[PDB]
Amino acid sequence: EVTPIQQLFLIKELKPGIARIGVIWDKNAANRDEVLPQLQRASAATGIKVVVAEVASLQEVAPQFRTLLRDHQVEALWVLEESGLLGQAAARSFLIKNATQAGMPVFAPSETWLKEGACVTWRKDAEGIRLVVNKAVAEAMGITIPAKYQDRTAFL
Incomplete structure (x- = not known):
């Protein structure tokens, strides 16, 4: 329900400077x-x-x-x-571990991944996109929440 292009525009703000x-x-x-x-x-x-x-x-x-x-x-x-x-x-397990040990955040399709170490996933509510965040990993990885989504973000 969140399209690939919407996801990558979110990623641009969640990990600013990513190239x-x-x-x-x-x-x-x-x-x-x-x-x-x-x-x-x-x-x-x-x-x-x-x-x-x-x-x-x-x-x-x-x-x-x-x-x-x-x-x-x-x-x-x-x-x-x-x-x-x-x-x-x-x-x-393999992808999360080897990403994390390379210093890379993982943007994932479901909360199952978050329960295992991935940083962020997303859902589409009636008020648009809502973020779900693994608080512990996201804080360590320097993930930043765009101002528009500050009130539309749940922690795992």
Whole structure:
């Protein structure tokens, strides 16, 4: 319900100064032909370079994440859905840990990720976007809340 471009405009204010972000995308997720071109338009619009690494299985997760970190030097990890591989505990745990140990915040699709270490997720209420924040991790990672959302932010 929060579109990819709305999400990346939020990320721009949550981690101000970010210039490069990494997306881990499940090759078996629905809507690749919509989402993936939308990420590239979101990148041009926001000024944040978006690099996508696609994965189909758990053995692809670690090599693809290392490509995002060493070949592209991304500053955050962004996960857009969790219907399949990215809803498994092993993949979730691996991505949060290796992101955090690289100094990268994780922007995540559900509160399950927050319960395990991810920083921010989002929902769309009748009064628009509302943020859900892992207070402990977000304070350590220097996450900042845009003024418009100060009153629309819940802590886990």
